[PDB]
């Protein structure tokens, strides 16, 4: 599923991301725009043999099992396929664990480089939330 901007904002709000560990909703919408272009089915292969999955491009080395990343810790206890669903529940639950782990949203390369220190409120402007 390719989300609309305001559609995704509302889904993310319902799932408890607004101000989760101090990150406003705009941060999460901006991260999803630049990680996946709001596409739940986005996959990207890394040089280390790992793969990033779904709307928040969660990585197969630490967070999910895709059966082809030797020494996956599978810390979210989920097949990586579950992260590609039109229902973002699994992606949200796993993201909450990632953003808790120490480095916060800096775990997302696209957030650090394209969202961090910008007017992220622009991403939820015009939305009925
Ligand atoms: Cl915001
Ligand atoms: Cl933080």
Swiss-Prot record:
This protein's GO CC annotations: cytoplasm; endoplasmic reticulum; extracellular space
Subcellular location: Secreted
PROSITE patterns according to UniProt: GLYCOSYL_HYDROL_F22_1, GLYCOSYL_HYDROL_F22_2
Enzyme class: hydrolase
Keywords, sorted A to Z: Allergen, Antimicrobial, Bacteriolytic enzyme, Disulfide bond, Glycosidase, Hydrolase, Secreted, Signal
Binding residue positions for substrate: 101
Residues forming the catalytic site: 35, 52
Reaction catalysis annotation: Hydrolysis of (1->4)-beta-linkages between N-acetylmuramic acid and N-acetyl-D-glucosamine residues in a peptidoglycan and between N-acetyl-D-glucosamine residues in chitodextrins
GO molecular function: beta-N-acetylglucosaminidase activity; identical protein binding; lysozyme activity
Keyword Disulfide bond belongs to the record: yes
Transmembrane segments: none
Domain C-type lysozyme: 1-129
E.C. number(s) listed in UniProt: 3.2.1.17
Coiled coil: none
Protein family membership: Belongs to the glycosyl hydrolase 22 family.
Biological role stated in the UniProt entry: Lysozymes have primarily a bacteriolytic function; those in tissues and body fluids are associated with the monocyte-macrophage system and enhance the activity of immunoagents. Has bacteriolytic activity against M.luteus.
Note in the entry: Lysozyme C is capable of both hydrolysis and transglycosylation; it also shows a slight esterase activity. It acts rapidly on both peptide-substituted and unsubstituted peptidoglycan, and slowly on chitin oligosaccharides.
Name assigned to this protein: Lysozyme C
Organism: Gallus gallus (Chicken)
Gene: LYZ
């Amino acid at each position: 599923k390719v989300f609309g901007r305001c559609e995704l904002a509302a889904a993310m709000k319902r799932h408890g991301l607004d101000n989760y560990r101090g990150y406003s909703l705009g941060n999460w919408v901006c991260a999803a725009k630049f990680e996946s272009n709001f596409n739940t089915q986005a996959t990207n292969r890394n040089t280390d043999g790992s793969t990033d999955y779904g709307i928040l491009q969660i990585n197969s080395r630490w967070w999910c099992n895709d059966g082809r990343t030797p020494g996956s810790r599978n810390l979210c206890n989920i097949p990586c396929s579950a992260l590609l669903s039109s229902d973002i529940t699994a992606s949200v639950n796993c993201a909450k664990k990632i953003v808790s782990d120490g480095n916060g949203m800096n775990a997302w390369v696209a957030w650090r480089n394209r969202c961090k220190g910008t007017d992220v409120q622009a991403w939820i402007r015009g939305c009925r939330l």
